[PDB]
Amino acid sequence: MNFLDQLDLIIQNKHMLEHTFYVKWSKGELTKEQLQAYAKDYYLHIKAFPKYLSAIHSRCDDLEARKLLLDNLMDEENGYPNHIDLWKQFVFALGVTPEELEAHEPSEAAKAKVATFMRWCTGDSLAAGVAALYSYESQIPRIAREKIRGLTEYFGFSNPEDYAYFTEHEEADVRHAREEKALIEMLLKDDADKVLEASQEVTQSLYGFLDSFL
Template sequence: MIEQAKPIYSDKFVQEMQAVIARWSLLKHPFYEIWNRGELTLQALREYAKQYYAHVQAFPTYLSAVHSRCQDMAARQVLLENLIDEERGAENHPELWLRFAEGLGVSREEVRSAQLLPETVASVKALQRLTRGDRFIDGVAALYAYESQVPEVARSKREGLAKFYGLEDARAVSYFTVHEQADVEHSEGEVSLLLAHCDTEDSRRRAIEAAEQSAKAMWGFLDGICNAYVD
């Protein structure tokens, strides 16, 4: 996760949540470590692009599920801004991911029709479950566990694609460029909501548990990729 200097990140509860997420840091997963060393085959990257699209496509529904369960107008507006960023216009995030896949030589139809690995299906179902519970703030914690890691992951992916795979075309890597900044802002909004709505020891405990389950789900997704496509 990108280090944050703002006061909200110095809160003990937030730091405890970040420590739990860090145990399942995506950048420490073998798949991303291999990527960052330039040792992934192009075919493995292509298969990853097909599988990860399941989350890119589903992420707006994670957001809308949390939004629909929130009764606080100010919190709903924070979530809505995030959702708008994901889906609005021709530059919506699923579209940006399809452009990345095309940059790797994978057609849109191949991405959309890909047979999903069991681990991919399980990770999507886990995020759906976490974001569709009765307590919207637990869903926010699950979103935070995911989005707080994205800026640093996106930067490292973009740099690795350029350095090792010659993929520097702005259109092809726009998904990563956008997320280097967008999810810094999204994460900040989610932290503000967590601090405002987790006002008891029990609510903080539940939120931390949701964050850990979310982080573990994404780690499990990468386990599936590694097992299927990395020798």
Template sequence: MDKMANTELLKKLDAAIAEKSLLKHPFYQDWRAGKLSRESLQLYAAQYYRHVEAFPKHLRVLVARTNGPLQGLIRENLAEEENPAGPHPKLWRDFAAAVGVGEDDITCRPALPGTQAVVQKFREICGDRPVEEAVAALYAYESQVPEIATTKVAGLKKFYGVTEPEGLAYFEVHEDADKAHRAAWREWLGEHADGNEM
């Protein structure tokens, strides 16, 4: 695939991401408008933890399937996820605690079918799909996270009484970190979407 074809591919991918933007989902619209019940927020915090906890595992699987610059890119992302000063699953548990979710609610509550599907889909993408497809999927996912995180922080402060740094840290980290991830995934796709440098 030449540069021009890659540019067209990225345009199509960006259009698809914009069309299916998570910020258009009713849950996120309700979050921004302060319409979520405390119970809905707590259920979300308990369930989404499964994805946050599994995400580094998915990246490790993808690291094992790659080499060269792409492997380095994924390792950097993984290092941020597992940062000893603030591993992302711990930051998420801090958010969950800030909205009234206990450790037992996170670890003992069964995953709902939709939660299981998200974790399974990421496992499949990172473990079984062609590497180019995995990178495109990670780009589609992480390209939306900074704006979603900003929206969540604003909503948590304004409507849901979460103002302590610990309760906001997960989202504040992602406001910045995923801008870099978005740019890195996009750059790789622009240069290597033909699969020659995995």
């Protein structure tokens, strides 16, 4: 049918919450040493996400589009604590030291997840760049919901500042997903095919990243 509806369908069937990792999470059947490996490896992506949005904005001449992209990037980076500071917090309440986090060498699967995002956001299809982000962010409110359930049920999280990252994204990425859907429309330049192509890589590139922990 319509391509946004096809876009949502690729996402529905390659959705993170169905991977074995979050299946292992939904049922507690995960380990601390695993989630510490997950939190550290994710850190490359958290630092990189503001660049994804800068990349698209830098190539955009739709003034109204840039305001919406600047809105997201403000949410991600501006002020204290930003989403990065919020992710560091989470890593630390998992028993990891600041020196262990800073020294960690990003995995091959981690550097790979970032280059797919970065490839599309610097590509030639502005609509496909957004669509790459949308493929990640549209899942995060539901993922972050179950992450909070799994963190406090099984891994002994009592202080809710520890999972403040997932609390903010429970609500933040409902807006980002919705605003990004609009952005795809606004910036479409006959590149529906690239849009769905981007969706394909990101959905998989994430599945590859989550494989690494198992």
